[PDB]
């Protein structure tokens, strides 16, 4: 038998096989599986200690992490997410795929049992508050991929909410048994949405708003890259000023890798002219910074800024030609 961390690092079986094998143990004994998942995030950070079942039942995440820094048993500053080579690069990919597939497989029952998600989010939040860069880096990446997976759960719920509403109207156009059943299912799917958004809110207010301004460049880059993913995949909920402000504030970052994450996050939004009204205030506010980054001392940052400024110019009122609108509306 191999630990949950050692299976993902090896990457022999598909991540879904590891996820399904864990879910089966969760249905056999919730505490044993959660202890394995807790140790998975601990050991993915390079820590070689092991959370005992007695600690998981009697300690808070605060004391548990303090004990695991004692038992880290390292020989250098390295931890898996900073290890060179394509081997640990596939680990990072497998580590992220495991988090996404886990929530994808749990999204229809287990995610709502008020035990797994509360345990996982509390652990990642505590690890994101630790001064140990290995714990803070690993959990921040895990929380960002966890949020994206939860966004996908919210998109499925909305699709399901609309179809349940369509089914309710189809039945109503004929109360009886099926009409009561469809109403309760609508009420159920609405309560699911409030739980998923409560989890996403816990991750954002508890981890993101602190780690986006982390002292380490790649931790800021991890947060900026994922908030751009959320705004692209769920623009109706995430593409607004209260979320864009974090990307705009980070445009002035001292590290080019972080400024590049900001520009690439904005670029995928500005390629869709249907999102320009949602970006108008942001464009007006950060216009001067974005054009100034076109001559950034980092080549990749400047190229992306020129690419971004080109989209902004092409979607403005100045790019609207008279002869073309006369051409479309002739005769």
């Amino acid at each position: 038998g191999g630990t949950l961390f050692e299976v993902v690092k090896l990457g022999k079986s598909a991540m879904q096989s590891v996820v399904d094998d864990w879910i089966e143990s969760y249905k056999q004994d919730r505490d044993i599986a959660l202890l394995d998942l807790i140790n998975f995030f601990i050991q993915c950070s390079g820590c070689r200690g092991t959370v005992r079942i007695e600690m998981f039942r009697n300690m808070q995440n605060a004391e548990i992490i303090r004990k695991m820094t004692e038992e880290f048993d390292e020989d250098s500053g390295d931890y898996p997410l900073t290890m060179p080579g394509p081997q640990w690069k596939k680990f990072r990919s497998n580590f992220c795929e495991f988090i996404g597939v886990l929530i994808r497989q749990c999204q229809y029952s287990i995610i709502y049992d008020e035990y797994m998600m509360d345990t996982v989010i509390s652990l990642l939040t505590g690890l994101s508050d630790s001064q140990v860069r290995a714990f803070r880096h690993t959990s921040t990446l895990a929380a960002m991929k966890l949020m994206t997976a939860l966004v996908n759960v919210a998109l499925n719920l909305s699709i399901h909410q609309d179809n349940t509403q369509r089914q309710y109207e189809a039945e109503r156009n004929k109360a009886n048994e099926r009409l009561e059943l469809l109403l309760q299912k609508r009420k159920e799917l609405q309560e699911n949405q409030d739980e998923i958004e409560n989890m996403m809110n816990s991750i954002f207010k508890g981890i993101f708003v602190h780690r986006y301004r982390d002292a380490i460049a790649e931790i800021r880059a991890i947060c900026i890259e994922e908030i751009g993913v959320w705004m692209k995949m769920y623009s109706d909920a995430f593409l607004n000023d209260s979320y864009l402000k974090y990307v705009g504030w980070t445009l002035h970052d001292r590290q080019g890798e972080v400024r590049l994450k900001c520009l690439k996050a904005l670029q995928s939004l500005y390629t869709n002219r249907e999102l320009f009204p949602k970006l108008e205030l942001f464009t007006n506010r950060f216009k001067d910074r974005i054009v100034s980054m076109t001559l950034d001392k980092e080549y990749d940052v400047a190229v992306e800024a020129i690419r971004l400024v080109t989209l902004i110019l092409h979607g403005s009122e100045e790019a609207l030609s008279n002869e073309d609108c006369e051409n479309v509306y002739h005769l």
């Binding site: 390292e74 250098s76 500053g77 931890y79 140990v132 803070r136 301004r213 002292a215 504030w249």
Partner: peptide
């Protein structure tokens, strides 16, 4: 001790003036 430990975890407001 070789474990990387960051005393200050976040960028302070006195340096977000960029």
């Amino acid at each position: 001790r070789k474990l990387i430990v960051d005393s200050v975890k976040e960028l302070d407001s006195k340096t977000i003036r960029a």
